[PDB]
Design a protein around this ligand. Structure first.
Ligand SMILES: Cc1nc2c(O)cccc2c(=O)[nH]1
Ligand SMILES: [Zn+2]
Length: 199
């Protein structure tokens, strides 16, 4: 399939050399994609498209839809129940929102928890090349996105906006990140099962 080839391409081409030297996500340059499953949750799709239309009508008929990565130990809970802002932490860089990356390697750092947690459950390795990892390639409605460089502890989107775009800066972020404050503003379209590969 050319659809799954595009997802595989997006996943491999957006890998970057991280500042922590592979402490959180692991030491790799490439992945071994094992499976790409299309998520068909009609209840989550109706929630997404209805909010997408709302945002579109509030942003000059433009949803500002982007395909972004999301890493989390609760990926299986998200494909069934959806994204939930009620579980979001106020302590986050851009506050109590749901965070997404345009770089697959950035989202990979969150697959086993914040900062890679303790790593894989069986070997307790953040750089495990054996254990199968799971990422989400989500359809995210950004709408009128608020451009921010430094920390901004938000509870909701800034007034008149629908999301926060974290842009890279010298003292701040190394890579971009996108924050929504409503669970229905994202749809977990693809479930990617993969492994990080030894360089
Ligand atoms: C839990 C989580 N956090 C992220 C982040 O803070 C920034 C960018 C991406 C992510 C992500 O994919 N998952
Ligand atoms: Zn392992």
């Amino acid at each position: 399939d050319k659809e799954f080839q595009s997802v595989e391409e997006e996943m491999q081409s957006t890998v970057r050399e991280h500042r922590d030297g592979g402490h959180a996500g692991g030491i790799f340059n490439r992945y071994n994609i094992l499976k790409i499953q299309k998520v068909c949750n009609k209840k989550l799709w109706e929630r997404y498209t209805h909010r997408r239309k709302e945002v579109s009508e509030e942003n000059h008929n433009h949803a500002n839809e982007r395909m972004l990565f999301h890493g989390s130990p609760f990926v299986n809970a998200i494909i069934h129940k959806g994204f939930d802002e009620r579980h979001a932490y106020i302590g986050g860089m851009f506050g109590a929102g749901i965070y997404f990356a345009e770089n697959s390697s950035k989202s990979n750092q969150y697959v086993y928890g914040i900062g890679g947690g303790t790593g894989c459950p069986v070997h307790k390795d953040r750089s495990c090349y054996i254990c199968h990892r799971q990422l989400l390639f989500c359809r995210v409605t950004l709408g009128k996105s608020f451009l921010q460089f430094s920390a901004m502890k938000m509870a909701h989107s800034p007034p008149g906006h629908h999301s926060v775009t974290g842009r890279p800066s010298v003292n701040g972020l190394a890579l971009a990140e996108y924050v929504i404050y409503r669970g229905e503003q994202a749809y977990p379209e693809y479930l990617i099962t993969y492994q990080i590969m030894r360089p």
